[PDB]
Every structure is written in structure tokens, then in C-alpha cells.
């Protein structure tokens, strides 16, 4: 099957003498598994998923030291950027990075990623060939030239084809029965007040995992892709998700409508009706 690992890094400078805050979050199949935050009492990478407790202290030490280095690196790059963009000291700035790999169905490297954003906008990114860069503006063209001269791409390419892949395979092994779990949605329909003979029927899907899901209302079992109200999928805070879809219906005609719920944990799609 297809899998992925990613490290999301953020560095924010703040008004004053105080140094930037650096946060690094690791993910495997979009699930946070490690985290480092320079704001903590004793800054260190910490497991964020039970299965990471398997890693010994040499791992946490190595990773924490890598992060202490990143903190400085981001401090330097943030300063360089202020110069490229002609910005004064005393403002708030944000530098972000996303790095990692995607494995194909054959479990081989499908694509390597390494990009940066500044003030929330694309700054520079390594292309799929993992040899050349795409700069988003003039300032980033400065970085691009600098890195082509230094051969920065070769460093990331080795990481993306070596370490990223090796460790992603290891993590998938250690967290087998976890990343692959599913929680079927528990669904129900609510009924809400008729604006002049018209009632709103709302289909709720709750407690599901993962978050991918599709809710579809139908009339007499026939598709109803058009006048349907949806809500962005949301976290319940307990690890599961929620979502709902509603549709306006003529009071007295609600037994005709059915809501279909599709989700990987479901033995078959769910079919619901008001009451």
C-alpha cells in the first residue's frame, strides 16, 4: 500500500530580545508521532504515539540534538530573510518547512519533498528530480543560486532516498496494528423546524477514524447531488472525527429520503432515514 513520512518545522521570531520559537512535528501516514518544541522546560523530541516508546535513548538523544541544530539554523535563515526582503527588526516572522517521502504501492520511494514558506507563502522547493529548485520569488532566487553553488540538493536527495525511506519502513513495522485501525462511524438523523412547510434533515456521522468519509443524501434511493449542506470534517478531541450533511425537505415527505455513509471501517455503506 501507499505510505508517507513528513516533518513539519516552524520557526517564529517575536518582538523583543527573545529568540525564535522552534517547533518540529513528525508524521507517518499523516499521524503525529514525534514532537519537539523549544518553548518546553527541557526541550526534547518526545514520542506522540504509543508505538514510538520502542525507541531507545540513543534515538531520542540523536533526534533532540538534530533539533537543537535546527533551532540555530532557523535563527540564521530567519535573519538572512529579513535582509533579502528589506525588513526591519522588530516584527513577527514565520518560516516553515515540510520534508519527507511518499512510498508507492511497491513500497519504493515515489516522491521526495522539501519545501519552505516564509510568512505563509511558498519560498523555495526541491523539484521531483531532487536535483533542481523552484524559487517562488526574487528573494528565493538568492537562495536557489546559493544552494546550486553549494550542492544543497545532493544532501537532501541522499536523505530522501536513504534515511527517510529506511526509517519510514521501520516505523510502519513498529506501528503496524495502529496506523491501520479503523473506527466505523455511528450515524443518526436529526429533524429540524419547517420554514413554511419545509424541514431540514441532518445526517450525522460520529466517532469515525480515519477522517476520510462521504455522506450523501438521496430521494427514493436516487442521487441527490445538488442542494446539500455539508460541514468540513472535524476532530471530536478524542481521536475520532465527525461530519454532517443536511437537506431541505417537504414536511411529510421525509420518509422518502435516505442518507448514505461511506467509510473504510464499514462492512457495507450505512443507510439511514429520519426516525
Amino acid at each position: 500500500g501507499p505510505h508517507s513520512m513528513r516533518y513539519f518545522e516552524t520557526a517564529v521570531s517575536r518582538p523583543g530580545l527573545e529568540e525564535p520559537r522552534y517547533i518540529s512535528v513528525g508524521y507517518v501516514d499523516n499521524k503525529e508521532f514525534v514532537r519537539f518544541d523549544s518553548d518546553a522546560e527541557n526541550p526534547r523530541y518526545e514520542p506522540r504515539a504509543p508505538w514510538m516508546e520502542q525507541e531507545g535513548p540513543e534515538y531520542w538523544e540523536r533526534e533532540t540534538q538534530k533539533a537543537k541544530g535546527q533551532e540555530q539554523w532557523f535563527r540564521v535563515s530567519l535573519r538572512n530573510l529579513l535582509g533579502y526582503y528589506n525588513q526591519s527588526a522588530g516584527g513577527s516572522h514565520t518560516l516553515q518547512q515540510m520534508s519527507g517521502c511518499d512510498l508507492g504501492s511497491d513500497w519504493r520511494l515515489l516522491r521526495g519533498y522539501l519545501q519552505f514558506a516564509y510568512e505563509g507563502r511558498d519560498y523555495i522547493a526541491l523539484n521531483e528530480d531532487l536535483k533542481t529548485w523552484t524559487a517562488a520569488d526574487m528573494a528565493a532566487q538568492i537562495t536557489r543560486r546559493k544552494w546550486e553553488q553549494s550542492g544543497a540538493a545532493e544532501h537532501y536527495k541522499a536523505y530522501l532516498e536513504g534515511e527517510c525511506v529506511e526509517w519510514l519502513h521501520r516505523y510502519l513495522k513498529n506501528g503496524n496494528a495502529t496506523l491501520l485501525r479503523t473506527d466505523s462511524p455511528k450515524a443518526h438523523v436529526t429533524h429540524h423546524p419547517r420554514s413554511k412547510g419545509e424541514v431540514t434533515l441532518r445526517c450525522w456521522a460520529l466517532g469515525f477514524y480515519p477522517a476520510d468519509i462521504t455522506l450523501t443524501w438521496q430521494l427514493n434511493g436516487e442521487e441527490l447531488t445538488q442542494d446539500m449542506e455539508l460541514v468540513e470534517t472535524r476532530p471530536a478531541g478524542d481521536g475520532t472525527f465527525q461530519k454532517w450533511a443536511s437537506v431541505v425537505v417537504p414536511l411529510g415527505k421525509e420518509q422518502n429520503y435516505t442518507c448514505r455513509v461511506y467509510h473504510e471501517g464499514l462492512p457495507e455503506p450505512l443507510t439511514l432515514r429520519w426516525e
Binding site: 532557523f74 535563515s77 523555495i124 526509517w167
Partner: peptide
């Protein structure tokens, strides 16, 4: 396992 930066932006 994360990557570290070498050359700066």
C-alpha cells in the same frame, strides 16, 4: 528520523 539543514537560506 528527521533531516537537518546544512547551508542556510
Amino acid at each position: 528520523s528527521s533531516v537537518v539543514g546544512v547551508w542556510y537560506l
